[PDB]
Design a protein around this ligand. Structure first.
Ligand SMILES: Nc1nc2c(ncn2[C@@H]2O[C@H](COP(=O)(O)OP(=O)(O)NP(=O)(O)O)[C@@H](O)[C@H]2O)c(=O)[nH]1
Ligand SMILES: [Mg+2]
Length: 170
């Protein structure tokens, strides 16, 4: 293989938090203004040079609501983005219930990052950054605020994960 490492990452979080757009903004630098709820499981790939070595991230992406294929979706996942909508406090509370789901199906030592998405909708921010920092520290998660719409921190969040995974694995 051309790459040194192949890291399977999963995106989870409630419907409409922007998971699919985060991905397409990372892989294909596009903001899908015309997005729609995801059917089944979609995939995407990116090959990066962190460390001076070749990393092929393999990103799985599924919808938020109504399963049983939870099974294959999480299996072998080695990093995860836990994404909530910065303007809808309901999506941020459900993060712990996603975190239990994610944890019942992965190794305790995967790299997990909490993402607060849509940080551009600044006048509707309904979740205090400090409260999300609280949940992140309480649960040993990484933490970022992102905007898929204006690319803010999207690259930083994904690479950060991928670097943190390699340090475990070397
Ligand atoms: N303002 C703004 N809107 C965003 C951002 N990211 C996503 N959205 C909006 O939120 C909606 C949901 O995006 P989408 O990525 O499809 O959500 P999802 O989390 O993938 N949903 P599902 O779980 O059902 O697939 C879209 O209408 C999109 O415009 C962002 O950074 N900023
Ligand atoms: Mg989607």
């Amino acid at each position: 293989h051309m790459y040194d490492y192949l890291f399977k990452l999963v995106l989870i979080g409630d419907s409409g938090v922007g998971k699919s757009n985060l991905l397409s903004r990372f892989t294909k630098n596009e903001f899908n203004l015309e997005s729609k709820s995801t059917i089944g499981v979609e995939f995407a790939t990116k090959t990066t040079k962190v460390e001076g070595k070749v990393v092929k991230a393999q990103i799985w992406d599924t919808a938020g609501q109504e399963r049983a294929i939870t099974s294959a979706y999480y299996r072998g996942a080695v990093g995860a983005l836990l994404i909530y909508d910065v303007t809808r406090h309901a999506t941020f509370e459900n993060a712990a219930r996603w975190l239990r789901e994610l944890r019942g199906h992965t190794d305790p030592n995967i790299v997990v990052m909490l993402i607060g998405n849509k940080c551009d909708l600044r006048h509707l921010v309904a979740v205090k950054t400090e409260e999300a920092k609280a949940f992140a520290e309480r649960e040993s998660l990484y933490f970022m605020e992102t905007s898929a719409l204006d690319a803010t921190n999207v690259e930083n969040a994904f690479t950060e994960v991928l670097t943190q995974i390699h340090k475990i694995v070397s």
